[PDB]
Amino acid sequence: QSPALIASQSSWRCVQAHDREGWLALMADDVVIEDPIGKSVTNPDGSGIKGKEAVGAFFDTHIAANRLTVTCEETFPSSSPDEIAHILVLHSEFDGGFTSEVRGVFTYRVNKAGLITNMRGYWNLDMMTFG
């Protein structure tokens, strides 16, 4: 498996399993998570979640006590072992009850070491479904 595919697959696994230290272990010190790209509830100023401290902070307040499910519908390798794209379905479940789901394209970049430098999501709240 390419470094990008390993990292993205390991990323989904840690998040779903609520593995804080495993998730952060996948990340470069200079990581930027734009989920989604542009201004949204999960990217308030559009500049993304920047650095492992911020990423852990996000996990703590927004993943720790919430159920998240990630379904990979399709994977698109590039001609670089370090860059990859996927069609993912994100399903979130807050206690007690409120659900949201969104389907979008997600891009990942890793550095030479195989650590995630970028995760970028193409979706918006107009595309989201609620229950």
Rounded Cα gap, residues 44 and 46, in angstroms: 6
- Binding-residue total with a copy of itself (CB under 8 A): 28
Rounded Cα gap, residues 32 and 27, in angstroms: 9
What does 66 interact with, of a copy of itself, ligand LDA, none (CB < 5 to 8 A by kind)?
ligand LDA
Binding residues among 29-58 for a copy of itself as defined by CB under 8 A: 36-40, 43, 46
Q: Which is nearer to a copy of itself, 34 or 52 (CB)?
A: 34
Q: Which is nearer to ligand LDA, 1 or 69 (CB)?
A: 69
Binding residues among 57-76 for ligand LDA as defined by CB under 6 A: 62-63, 66, 68
Query: How many other C-beta atoms can be found within 10 angstroms of the C-beta atom of residue 60?
Result: 11
Does 78 engage in binding with a copy of itself (CB under 8 A)? yes
Rounded Cα gap, residues 82 and 1, in angstroms: 11
Does 41 engage in binding with ligand LDA (CB under 6 A)? yes
Binding residues among 5-34 for ligand LDA as defined by CB under 6 A: 15
Burial class (CB in 10 A: 0-12, 13-18, 19+), 106: buried
- Sequence-distant (6+) residues with CB within 8 A of 53 are none
Q: What does the binding site for ligand LDA look like in residue numbers (CB under 6 A)?
A: 15, 35, 41-42, 62-63, 66, 68, 90, 92, 100
